[PDB]
Amino acid sequence: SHMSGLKPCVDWLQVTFKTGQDSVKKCVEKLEKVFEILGLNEAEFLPLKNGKYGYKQGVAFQGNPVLAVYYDGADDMGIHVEMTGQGCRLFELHTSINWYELFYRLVYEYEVNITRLDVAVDDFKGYFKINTLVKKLKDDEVTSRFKKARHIENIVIEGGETIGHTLYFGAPSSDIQVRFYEKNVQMGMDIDVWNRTEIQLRDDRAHVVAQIIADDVLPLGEIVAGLLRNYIQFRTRKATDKNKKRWPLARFWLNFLGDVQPLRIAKQ
Amino acid sequence: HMSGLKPCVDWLQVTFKTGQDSVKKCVEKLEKVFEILGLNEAEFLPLKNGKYGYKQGVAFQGNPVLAVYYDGADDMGIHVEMTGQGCRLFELHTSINWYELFYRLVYEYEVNITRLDVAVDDFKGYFKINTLVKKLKDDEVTSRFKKARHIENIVIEGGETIGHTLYFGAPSSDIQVRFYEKNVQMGMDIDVWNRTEIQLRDDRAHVVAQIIADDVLPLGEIVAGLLRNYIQFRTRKATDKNKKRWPLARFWLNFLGDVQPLRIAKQM
């Protein structure tokens, strides 16, 4: 492909429109309103076979469950929107608004719980190999606010080659998880370099980042880079000192974080 | 102090369909479901939330490991979910047994069995998971699967790798096999505890259910047969380069031979 550089994006979104709150912001109660808030044409939503998460019914954009709106749950469950990775791309292709506008509305105009937001960086240049990260972890060259990482690798049974590496930091249910993987391998695509770094945020953490996107002032890159820097330090072993806390941050990592900083969600 | 090999049923999910023109009886009431399970109606309490598109649920002694979901969209029926712990809980309190439950589900009532897991606990230690990993990477394995996933945990302070796990097949596909160190997974102070699990979905699950219900073959023979057929750990033979003519490894032949006669007892 002609894919190059680093590119940031929003990669998951789940929000719930609450009902019957005495709130300063507007409560949403109708599906039609939800479609409008998204900047998407009502006519394009179709019913789904099944609900999900305790909601008895759902609709989806062009019938596609990657971009779904669930409703008719137990008392006070409101309306729940779910936009997977693919759904965020689908949103982008058809919405009449901008990410910042969507988040403006969710943050400032309506009464919503933002339950999950994932932000990502695609790396088409190749600042590092995931396996280098794995190695650094196993060689005791990493510090972090997390206690453990999960390492997943695929093994092709005929031949025995290890082809794709994934690292997960934090529990999936907790309010911040970081993931690194080879997205070329994951997607079955024939591109030499495509690494993905993802931060998954839940509840309050997700709201704050939504607000920052809404206000549109700080580049998204700065939030991603600030969070990665703070949560995880890949370091270079220094023979002189045994205190890991005084090893310098590794060069590939400083370069990655420094080139991530200025990145902005594309506007149009 | 535990020893040997022990089989068990380790997950079950079924849906009672409504309004089928069927030779078998349609179930339409929760009370009937409790009776089919041989469990006391009085012991079921409401859950906070539904799940999977069902708006409401109850659970045995309030405990969601053994749950019954209902009030979903038209034609969704009633869904029972029994996790690992729920299968143990079922065993302790039911007035019937596994054979009778599967008899009822396969021959008496109109049900979709969506998932069934069967497991073997190994307290002797017929192999180490890491040996299996190594054999895979050394090109000493053939299988009907194309890939395995190897999952390991890495402790960030120190870099120690703990908790090796191997998965064969995708989690959505209709047969998956898993091997892991269950002593490590459960945080328990037992020297050797390996677990082998076969997860089956839809028709694959029904077939094994039907085998249990017919009560002609030991369960051990189905587990051992599936393992043998789907995965072959082999010993490298210097004379021949063709993997297909390497003999099966000894530990593996010993494991499968001792799994064969294992049974699900008639008393829980």
Coordinates of C-alpha atoms in Angstrom, one line a residue:
Chain A
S1 CA 0.0 0.0 0.0
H2 CA 1.0 3.7 0.2
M3 CA 0.4 3.6 4.0
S4 CA 3.1 5.4 5.8
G5 CA 4.0 7.2 9.1
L6 CA 2.1 7.2 12.3
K7 CA -1.7 7.8 12.3
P8 CA -4.0 8.2 15.4
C9 CA -7.6 7.3 15.5
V10 CA -10.6 6.5 17.6
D11 CA -11.2 2.8 17.6
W12 CA -14.0 1.9 19.9
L13 CA -16.9 3.8 21.4
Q14 CA -19.7 2.7 23.8
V15 CA -22.1 5.2 25.3
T16 CA -25.4 5.0 27.2
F17 CA -28.0 7.7 27.0
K18 CA -29.5 7.9 30.4
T19 CA -33.2 8.5 31.1
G20 CA -35.1 10.3 33.8
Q21 CA -32.2 12.1 35.4
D22 CA -32.8 15.5 36.7
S23 CA -29.8 16.8 34.8
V24 CA -28.6 20.2 33.5
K25 CA -27.9 18.5 30.1
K26 CA -30.6 17.1 27.8
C27 CA -31.8 13.5 28.3
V28 CA -32.3 11.6 25.0
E29 CA -35.3 9.2 24.9
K30 CA -35.8 8.4 21.2
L31 CA -33.9 6.4 18.7
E32 CA -34.4 9.1 16.1
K33 CA -32.7 11.6 18.2
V34 CA -29.7 9.2 18.7
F35 CA -29.4 8.9 14.9
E36 CA -29.3 12.7 14.6
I37 CA -26.7 13.1 17.4
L38 CA -24.5 10.7 15.4
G39 CA -25.0 12.7 12.2
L40 CA -26.4 9.6 10.5
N41 CA -29.4 9.1 8.3
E42 CA -32.3 7.5 10.1
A43 CA -33.4 5.8 6.9
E44 CA -30.2 3.8 7.0
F45 CA -30.8 1.9 10.3
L46 CA -32.3 -1.6 10.2
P47 CA -33.5 -3.9 13.0
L48 CA -31.1 -6.6 14.3
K49 CA -32.2 -10.2 14.9
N50 CA -31.1 -10.0 18.6
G51 CA -30.4 -7.5 21.4
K52 CA -27.3 -7.7 23.5
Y53 CA -26.1 -6.9 27.1
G54 CA -29.4 -7.1 28.7
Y55 CA -31.2 -5.0 26.0
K56 CA -34.0 -6.9 24.3
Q57 CA -33.8 -5.1 20.9
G58 CA -31.4 -3.4 18.6
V59 CA -31.0 -1.5 15.3
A60 CA -27.8 -1.1 13.3
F61 CA -26.4 1.1 10.5
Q62 CA -27.1 -0.6 7.2
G63 CA -28.0 -3.7 9.3
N64 CA -24.4 -3.9 10.3
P65 CA -23.8 -4.8 14.1
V66 CA -20.4 -3.0 14.2
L67 CA -22.5 0.1 14.6
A68 CA -25.4 -0.7 16.8
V69 CA -27.9 0.9 19.0
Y70 CA -29.5 -1.2 21.7
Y71 CA -32.7 -0.5 23.6
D72 CA -35.6 -1.9 25.6
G73 CA -33.5 -3.1 28.6
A74 CA -34.5 -3.1 32.3
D75 CA -35.7 0.0 34.1
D76 CA -33.2 2.8 33.7
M77 CA -30.9 1.2 31.2
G78 CA -31.6 3.8 28.5
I79 CA -30.2 3.5 25.0
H80 CA -26.7 2.0 24.4
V81 CA -24.6 2.8 21.3
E82 CA -21.7 0.5 20.4
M83 CA -19.2 1.2 17.7
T84 CA -16.5 -1.3 17.3
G85 CA -13.2 -0.6 15.4
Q86 CA -14.9 -1.4 12.1
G87 CA -17.9 0.6 13.2
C88 CA -15.7 3.7 13.8
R89 CA -14.5 3.5 10.2
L90 CA -18.1 3.0 9.0
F91 CA -19.1 6.0 11.0
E92 CA -16.4 8.1 9.4
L93 CA -17.5 7.2 5.9
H94 CA -21.1 8.3 6.3
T95 CA -21.5 10.7 9.2
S96 CA -22.1 14.3 8.4
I97 CA -20.2 15.6 11.5
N98 CA -16.6 15.4 12.9
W99 CA -15.3 13.3 15.8
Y100 CA -14.8 16.5 17.9
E101 CA -18.4 17.5 17.2
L102 CA -19.7 14.0 18.3
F103 CA -17.7 14.2 21.4
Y104 CA -18.8 17.8 22.1
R105 CA -22.4 16.7 22.0
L106 CA -21.8 13.7 24.2
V107 CA -19.7 15.6 26.7
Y108 CA -21.5 19.0 26.9
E109 CA -24.9 18.8 25.3
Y110 CA -26.4 15.5 26.4
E111 CA -26.6 13.3 29.5
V112 CA -24.6 10.2 28.7
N113 CA -22.3 7.7 30.2
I114 CA -19.3 7.1 28.1
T115 CA -18.5 3.5 29.1
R116 CA -15.7 2.7 26.8
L117 CA -13.4 4.6 24.4
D118 CA -10.4 3.2 22.7
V119 CA -7.7 5.3 21.1
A120 CA -5.1 3.9 18.8
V121 CA -2.0 4.7 16.8
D122 CA -1.1 2.9 13.5
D123 CA 2.6 2.6 12.8
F124 CA 3.4 1.9 9.1
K125 CA 7.1 2.9 9.4
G126 CA 8.2 0.5 12.1
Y127 CA 9.5 2.1 15.2
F128 CA 9.9 -1.3 16.9
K129 CA 9.0 -4.9 16.6
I130 CA 6.5 -6.2 19.2
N131 CA 8.9 -9.0 19.8
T132 CA 11.5 -6.5 21.0
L133 CA 9.0 -5.4 23.6
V134 CA 8.4 -9.0 24.7
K135 CA 12.2 -9.5 25.0
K136 CA 12.7 -6.4 27.0
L137 CA 10.0 -7.5 29.4
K138 CA 11.6 -10.9 29.9
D139 CA 15.0 -9.4 30.3
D140 CA 13.7 -7.2 33.2
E141 CA 14.2 -4.0 31.3
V142 CA 10.7 -2.5 31.8
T143 CA 9.0 -0.6 34.6
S144 CA 5.3 0.1 34.7
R145 CA 2.3 1.1 36.7
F146 CA 1.0 -2.4 35.7
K147 CA 2.2 -5.6 37.5
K148 CA 2.0 -8.0 34.5
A149 CA 1.7 -8.3 30.8
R150 CA 0.1 -11.1 28.7
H151 CA 2.0 -12.2 25.7
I152 CA 0.2 -14.0 22.9
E153 CA 1.9 -15.5 19.9
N154 CA 0.6 -17.5 17.0
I155 CA 2.3 -20.7 15.9
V156 CA 1.8 -22.1 12.4
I157 CA 1.6 -25.8 13.0
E158 CA 3.1 -26.9 9.6
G159 CA 6.6 -25.4 9.9
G160 CA 6.5 -24.2 13.5
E161 CA 7.0 -20.5 12.7
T162 CA 5.9 -17.9 15.3
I163 CA 4.1 -15.3 13.2
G164 CA 2.2 -12.7 15.3
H165 CA 2.9 -11.2 18.6
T166 CA 0.4 -9.4 20.9
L167 CA 1.0 -7.8 24.3
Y168 CA -1.7 -6.8 26.7
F169 CA -1.1 -4.6 29.9
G170 CA -3.9 -4.4 32.5
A171 CA -7.1 -6.4 32.9
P172 CA -9.8 -6.1 30.1
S173 CA -12.5 -5.1 32.7
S174 CA -10.3 -2.5 34.4
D175 CA -10.5 1.1 33.4
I176 CA -7.2 1.3 31.4
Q177 CA -5.6 -1.4 29.2
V178 CA -2.8 -1.0 26.8
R179 CA -2.3 -3.3 23.8
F180 CA 0.4 -3.7 21.2
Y181 CA 0.1 -6.0 18.2
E182 CA 1.0 -6.7 14.6
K183 CA -2.2 -5.6 12.8
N184 CA -0.9 -6.8 9.4
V185 CA -0.8 -10.3 10.8
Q186 CA -4.1 -9.9 12.6
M187 CA -6.0 -8.6 9.6
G188 CA -4.5 -11.1 7.1
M189 CA -3.1 -8.3 5.0
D190 CA 0.1 -8.3 3.0
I191 CA 1.8 -5.2 4.3
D192 CA 5.3 -5.6 5.6
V193 CA 4.9 -3.1 8.6
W194 CA 1.7 -2.4 10.4
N195 CA 1.9 -2.2 14.2
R196 CA -1.0 -1.1 16.3
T197 CA -0.9 0.5 19.8
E198 CA -4.2 0.9 21.5
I199 CA -5.3 2.3 24.8
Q200 CA -8.7 1.1 26.0
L201 CA -10.4 3.4 28.5
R202 CA -13.5 2.8 30.5
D203 CA -15.9 5.0 32.5
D204 CA -14.3 8.2 34.0
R205 CA -11.1 7.6 32.1
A206 CA -13.0 7.4 28.9
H207 CA -15.0 10.5 29.6
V208 CA -11.9 12.7 30.2
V209 CA -10.4 11.7 26.9
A210 CA -13.7 12.2 25.2
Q211 CA -13.7 15.8 26.7
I212 CA -10.2 16.5 25.4
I213 CA -11.2 15.4 21.9
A214 CA -14.4 17.5 22.2
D215 CA -12.5 20.7 23.3
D216 CA -10.2 20.0 20.2
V217 CA -7.2 21.9 21.7
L218 CA -4.6 19.3 22.6
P219 CA -3.5 16.9 19.8
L220 CA -4.8 13.4 20.5
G221 CA -1.2 12.3 20.1
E222 CA -0.3 14.2 23.3
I223 CA -2.8 12.2 25.3
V224 CA -1.8 8.9 23.9
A225 CA 1.9 9.7 24.3
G226 CA 1.4 11.1 27.8
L227 CA -0.5 8.0 28.9
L228 CA 2.0 5.5 27.4
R229 CA 5.0 7.4 28.9
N230 CA 3.4 7.4 32.4
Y231 CA 2.2 3.8 32.4
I232 CA 5.0 2.0 30.7
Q233 CA 8.8 2.6 30.5
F234 CA 10.9 0.5 28.2
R235 CA 14.5 1.0 29.4
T236 CA 18.0 0.4 28.4
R237 CA 20.0 -1.7 30.8
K238 CA 22.9 0.2 32.4
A239 CA 25.7 -2.0 33.8
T240 CA 26.8 0.7 36.4
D241 CA 23.6 0.7 38.3
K242 CA 21.2 -2.1 39.3
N243 CA 18.3 0.2 40.2
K244 CA 16.0 -0.1 37.1
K245 CA 14.4 3.3 38.0
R246 CA 17.6 5.1 36.9
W247 CA 18.1 3.4 33.5
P248 CA 17.4 5.8 30.7
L249 CA 14.3 5.2 28.5
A250 CA 15.1 3.2 25.4
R251 CA 15.8 5.2 22.2
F252 CA 13.2 3.5 20.0
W253 CA 10.6 4.3 22.8
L254 CA 11.6 8.0 23.1
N255 CA 11.5 8.3 19.3
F256 CA 8.1 6.6 19.2
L257 CA 6.5 8.7 21.9
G258 CA 8.1 12.0 20.5
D259 CA 6.7 11.3 17.0
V260 CA 3.3 10.4 18.5
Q261 CA 2.9 13.6 20.5
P262 CA 2.0 16.0 17.6
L263 CA -0.5 13.7 16.0
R264 CA -4.1 14.9 15.4
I265 CA -7.3 13.2 14.4
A266 CA -7.8 14.0 10.7
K267 CA -10.5 16.6 10.3
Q268 CA -12.4 16.0 7.0
Chain B
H1 CA -3.5 -34.6 48.0
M2 CA -5.0 -35.4 44.5
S3 CA -4.0 -38.0 41.9
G4 CA -4.8 -39.4 38.5
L5 CA -6.9 -38.1 35.7
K6 CA -10.5 -37.0 36.2
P7 CA -13.1 -36.0 33.5
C8 CA -15.9 -33.6 33.9
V9 CA -18.5 -31.5 32.1
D10 CA -17.3 -28.0 32.5
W11 CA -19.7 -25.6 30.7
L12 CA -23.1 -25.9 29.4
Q13 CA -25.4 -23.5 27.5
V14 CA -28.8 -24.4 26.1
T15 CA -31.8 -22.6 24.8
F16 CA -35.4 -23.9 25.2
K17 CA -37.1 -22.9 22.0
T18 CA -40.7 -21.7 22.0
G19 CA -43.5 -22.3 19.4
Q20 CA -41.8 -24.9 17.3
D21 CA -44.0 -27.5 15.6
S22 CA -41.9 -30.3 17.1
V23 CA -42.3 -34.0 18.1
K24 CA -40.5 -33.0 21.4
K25 CA -42.1 -30.9 24.1
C26 CA -41.6 -27.1 24.0
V27 CA -40.9 -25.6 27.4
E28 CA -42.4 -22.2 28.0
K29 CA -42.2 -21.6 31.8
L30 CA -39.3 -21.0 34.2
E31 CA -40.7 -23.4 36.7
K32 CA -40.6 -26.2 34.1
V33 CA -36.9 -25.3 33.4
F34 CA -36.1 -25.6 37.1
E35 CA -37.8 -29.0 37.2
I36 CA -35.9 -30.2 34.1
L37 CA -32.7 -29.3 35.9
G38 CA -33.9 -31.2 39.1
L39 CA -33.4 -28.0 41.1
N40 CA -35.6 -26.5 43.7
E41 CA -37.7 -23.5 42.4
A42 CA -37.6 -21.8 45.8
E43 CA -33.8 -21.5 45.5
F44 CA -33.7 -19.3 42.4
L45 CA -33.4 -15.5 42.9
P46 CA -33.6 -12.6 40.5
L47 CA -30.3 -11.2 39.0
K48 CA -29.5 -7.4 38.7
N49 CA -29.1 -7.8 34.9
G50 CA -30.1 -9.9 31.9
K51 CA -27.5 -10.9 29.4
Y52 CA -27.3 -11.7 25.7
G53 CA -30.4 -10.0 24.6
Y54 CA -32.5 -11.3 27.4
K55 CA -33.9 -8.5 29.6
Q56 CA -34.1 -10.6 32.8
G57 CA -32.6 -13.5 34.6
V58 CA -32.7 -15.6 37.7
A59 CA -29.9 -17.6 39.3
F60 CA -29.5 -20.6 41.7
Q61 CA -29.1 -19.1 45.2
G62 CA -28.5 -15.7 43.4
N63 CA -25.3 -17.0 41.9
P64 CA -24.8 -16.1 38.2
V65 CA -22.6 -19.2 37.6
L66 CA -25.9 -21.0 37.2
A67 CA -28.3 -18.7 35.5
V68 CA -31.5 -18.8 33.5
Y69 CA -32.2 -15.9 31.2
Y70 CA -35.6 -14.9 29.8
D71 CA -37.7 -12.1 28.4
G72 CA -35.8 -11.8 25.2
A73 CA -37.2 -11.0 21.8
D74 CA -39.8 -13.1 20.1
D75 CA -38.7 -16.7 19.6
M76 CA -35.6 -16.4 21.9
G77 CA -37.0 -18.8 24.5
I78 CA -35.3 -19.4 27.7
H79 CA -31.5 -19.7 28.0
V80 CA -29.6 -21.6 30.6
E81 CA -26.0 -20.9 31.3
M82 CA -23.9 -23.1 33.6
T83 CA -20.2 -22.1 33.9
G84 CA -17.5 -24.4 35.3
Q85 CA -18.4 -23.4 38.8
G86 CA -22.0 -23.7 37.9
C87 CA -21.6 -27.3 36.8
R88 CA -20.1 -28.1 40.3
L89 CA -23.0 -26.2 41.9
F90 CA -25.5 -28.1 39.8
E91 CA -23.9 -31.4 40.8
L92 CA -24.2 -30.6 44.5
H93 CA -27.9 -29.8 44.6
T94 CA -29.6 -31.5 41.7
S95 CA -31.9 -34.4 42.2
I96 CA -30.9 -35.9 38.9
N97 CA -27.6 -36.6 37.1
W98 CA -25.7 -35.6 34.0
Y99 CA -27.0 -38.6 32.0
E100 CA -30.6 -37.7 32.8
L101 CA -30.1 -34.0 32.1
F102 CA -28.7 -34.8 28.7
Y103 CA -31.4 -37.4 28.1
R104 CA -34.0 -34.8 28.7
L105 CA -32.2 -32.2 26.6
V106 CA -31.5 -34.5 23.7
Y107 CA -34.7 -36.7 23.5
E108 CA -37.5 -35.2 25.7
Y109 CA -37.5 -31.4 25.0
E110 CA -36.9 -29.1 22.1
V111 CA -33.6 -27.3 22.9
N112 CA -30.6 -25.9 21.2
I113 CA -27.4 -26.9 22.9
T114 CA -25.2 -24.0 22.0
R115 CA -22.1 -24.8 24.0
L116 CA -20.7 -27.8 25.9
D117 CA -17.2 -28.0 27.4
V118 CA -15.6 -31.3 28.5
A119 CA -12.4 -31.4 30.6
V120 CA -9.8 -33.6 31.9
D121 CA -7.8 -32.8 35.1
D122 CA -4.3 -34.2 35.3
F123 CA -2.9 -34.5 38.8
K124 CA -0.1 -36.9 37.8
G125 CA 1.6 -34.8 35.2
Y126 CA 1.8 -36.6 31.9
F127 CA 3.5 -33.6 30.3
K128 CA 4.4 -30.0 30.9
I129 CA 2.6 -27.4 28.8
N130 CA 6.0 -25.9 27.9
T131 CA 7.0 -29.2 26.3
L132 CA 3.9 -28.9 24.0
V133 CA 4.9 -25.4 23.1
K134 CA 8.4 -26.5 22.3
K135 CA 7.3 -29.4 20.1
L136 CA 5.1 -27.0 18.1
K137 CA 7.9 -24.6 17.5
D138 CA 10.3 -27.5 16.6
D139 CA 7.9 -28.6 13.8
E140 CA 7.1 -31.9 15.6
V141 CA 3.3 -31.6 15.6
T142 CA 0.6 -32.3 13.0
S143 CA -3.0 -31.3 13.4
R144 CA -6.3 -30.6 11.7
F145 CA -5.9 -27.0 13.0
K146 CA -3.6 -24.6 11.1
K147 CA -2.4 -22.6 14.1
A148 CA -2.1 -22.7 17.8
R149 CA -2.0 -19.7 20.2
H150 CA 0.5 -19.6 22.9
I151 CA -0.3 -17.3 25.9
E152 CA 2.1 -16.6 28.7
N153 CA 2.1 -14.1 31.5
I154 CA 5.2 -12.0 32.2
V155 CA 5.8 -10.4 35.6
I156 CA 7.2 -6.9 34.8
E157 CA 9.4 -6.7 38.0
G158 CA 11.9 -9.5 37.3
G159 CA 10.7 -10.7 33.9
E160 CA 9.5 -14.2 34.9
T161 CA 7.2 -16.0 32.5
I162 CA 4.4 -17.9 34.3
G163 CA 1.1 -19.5 33.3
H164 CA 1.6 -21.2 29.9
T165 CA -1.5 -21.8 27.9
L166 CA -2.1 -23.3 24.5
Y167 CA -5.3 -22.8 22.4
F168 CA -6.1 -24.7 19.2
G169 CA -8.9 -23.3 17.0
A170 CA -10.8 -20.0 17.1
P171 CA -13.1 -19.2 20.1
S172 CA -16.1 -18.7 17.9
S173 CA -15.5 -21.9 15.8
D174 CA -17.3 -25.1 16.8
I175 CA -14.3 -27.0 18.3
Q176 CA -11.5 -25.5 20.4
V177 CA -8.9 -27.3 22.5
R178 CA -7.1 -25.7 25.4
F179 CA -4.2 -26.9 27.6
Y180 CA -3.1 -25.0 30.7
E181 CA -1.6 -25.1 34.1
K182 CA -4.7 -24.9 36.3
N183 CA -2.8 -24.8 39.6
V184 CA -1.1 -21.6 38.4
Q185 CA -4.4 -20.2 37.0
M186 CA -6.3 -20.8 40.2
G187 CA -3.6 -19.6 42.6
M188 CA -3.6 -22.9 44.4
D189 CA -0.7 -24.6 46.2
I190 CA -0.8 -27.9 44.3
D191 CA 2.3 -29.3 42.6
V192 CA 0.8 -30.7 39.4
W193 CA -2.5 -29.7 38.0
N194 CA -2.8 -29.6 34.2
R195 CA -6.0 -29.1 32.5
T196 CA -7.1 -30.1 29.1
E197 CA -10.4 -28.7 27.8
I198 CA -12.5 -29.2 24.7
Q199 CA -15.1 -26.6 23.9
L200 CA -17.8 -27.5 21.6
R201 CA -20.5 -25.4 20.0
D202 CA -23.8 -26.0 18.3
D203 CA -24.0 -29.3 16.4
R204 CA -20.6 -30.5 17.8
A205 CA -22.0 -29.9 21.2
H206 CA -25.2 -31.7 20.5
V207 CA -23.4 -34.8 19.3
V208 CA -21.4 -35.1 22.5
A209 CA -24.5 -34.4 24.5
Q210 CA -26.3 -37.3 22.6
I211 CA -23.4 -39.6 23.3
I212 CA -23.7 -38.9 27.0
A213 CA -27.4 -39.3 26.9
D214 CA -27.2 -42.7 25.0
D215 CA -24.8 -43.8 27.7
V216 CA -23.0 -46.5 25.5
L217 CA -19.5 -45.0 25.2
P218 CA -17.3 -43.7 28.1
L219 CA -16.8 -39.9 27.8
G220 CA -13.0 -40.7 28.0
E221 CA -13.3 -42.3 24.6
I222 CA -14.8 -39.2 23.0
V223 CA -12.2 -36.9 24.6
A224 CA -9.3 -39.1 23.7
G225 CA -10.6 -39.7 20.2
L226 CA -11.1 -36.0 19.5
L227 CA -7.6 -35.2 20.9
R228 CA -5.9 -38.0 18.9
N229 CA -7.7 -37.1 15.7
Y230 CA -7.2 -33.3 16.0
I231 CA -3.7 -33.1 17.4
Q232 CA -0.6 -35.3 17.0
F233 CA 2.5 -34.7 19.1
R234 CA 5.2 -36.6 17.3
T235 CA 8.8 -37.8 17.9
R236 CA 11.3 -36.5 15.3
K237 CA 12.8 -39.4 13.3
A238 CA 16.2 -38.7 11.7
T239 CA 15.7 -41.3 8.8
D240 CA 12.5 -39.6 7.4
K241 CA 11.7 -36.0 6.7
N242 CA 8.0 -36.7 6.2
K243 CA 6.4 -35.7 9.5
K244 CA 3.3 -37.8 8.7
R245 CA 5.4 -40.9 9.3
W246 CA 6.9 -40.0 12.6
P247 CA 5.5 -42.0 15.5
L248 CA 3.3 -40.3 18.1
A249 CA 5.3 -39.2 21.1
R250 CA 5.2 -41.6 24.1
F251 CA 3.9 -39.2 26.7
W252 CA 1.0 -38.4 24.3
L253 CA 0.2 -42.0 23.7
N254 CA 0.3 -42.7 27.4
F255 CA -1.9 -39.7 28.1
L256 CA -4.5 -40.6 25.5
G257 CA -4.5 -44.3 26.6
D258 CA -5.2 -43.4 30.2
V259 CA -7.9 -40.9 29.2
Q260 CA -9.9 -43.5 27.1
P261 CA -11.6 -45.4 30.0
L262 CA -12.6 -42.4 32.0
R263 CA -16.3 -42.0 32.8
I264 CA -18.7 -39.5 34.1
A265 CA -20.1 -41.2 37.2
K266 CA -23.8 -41.7 37.7
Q267 CA -23.7 -40.3 41.2
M268 CA -22.7 -36.6 41.2

